[PDB]
Nucleic acid binder design. Structure first.
Ligand SMILES: [Mg+2]
Length: 165
RNA sequence: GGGAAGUCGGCAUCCGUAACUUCGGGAAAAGGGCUCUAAGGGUUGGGCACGUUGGGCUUUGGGCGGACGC
């Protein structure tokens, strides 16, 4: 999987955990998006430098859910690594049209049996990773409206987590 | 009964009632579950057609044997 990345000439995207977050200076790299804010507050800076290297425009953007975890903006401000809001794309969201293209995954989940149990094991794994977030003042499991992550992750049926609804 | 009135000098404590506790196993949700880091039992298993090569289904011929028996 690593070799086919670095040798590919067509536009490519890796889907990775923190494996490629520190050190690897892959060439011709331009874009990073952070689907989940780092659980450790010291790998964001390293992750940004994965897109950068020398002169090249480093498209480093991170998502943030609405709520108190907007404060990740000024958490890094006092990290002395200021982060500004996105301006360059400025194409934000299509709202329901973003929901029904996320729906385009859900019937694919219906079509494919194996992708069914892959879904929650992805969900519970994310549930475990959030519960252990080091900063227990900006990230919290309490104010976590669940039924839109199932919509966000295209989950067919929210499993038997401790929280019941 | 009196009270020095004689003489110098008399003296695992036990039962009932109300809360509390031992042994073993065990970090990292609860009772489908995080990153990285090393081992995570072995053995065997890559499709479909063509003209193509080989022996593999009829046909043709040859050779060695030409035999056995009379
Ligand atoms: Mg380095």
């Amino acid at each position: 999987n690593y070799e086919r990345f670095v040798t590919a000439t067509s536009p490519t995207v890796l889907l990775t955990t923190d494996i490629a977050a520190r050190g690897l200076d892959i060439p011709q790299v331009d874009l990073v998006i952070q689907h989940d804010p780092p659980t450790d507050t010291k790998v964001f800076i390293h992750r940004c430098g994965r897109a950068g290297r020398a002169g090249r425009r480093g498209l480093s953007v991170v998502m943030l859910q609405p709520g108190r975890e907007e404060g990740y903006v000024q958490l890094l401000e006092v990290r002395q690594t200021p982060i500004t809001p996105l301006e360059h794309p400025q194409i934000s969201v299509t709202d329901t049209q973003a929901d029904d293209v996320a729906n385009k995954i859900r019937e694919q989940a219906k079509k494919d049996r194996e992708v069914f149990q892959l879904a929650q094991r992805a969900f519970v794994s994310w549930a475990r990773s959030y519960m252990e977030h080091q900063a227990t003042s900006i990230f919290r499991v309490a104010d976590l409206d669940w039924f839109d992550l199932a919509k966000g992750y295209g989950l067919l049926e929210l499993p038997k987590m401790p929280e019941t609804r």
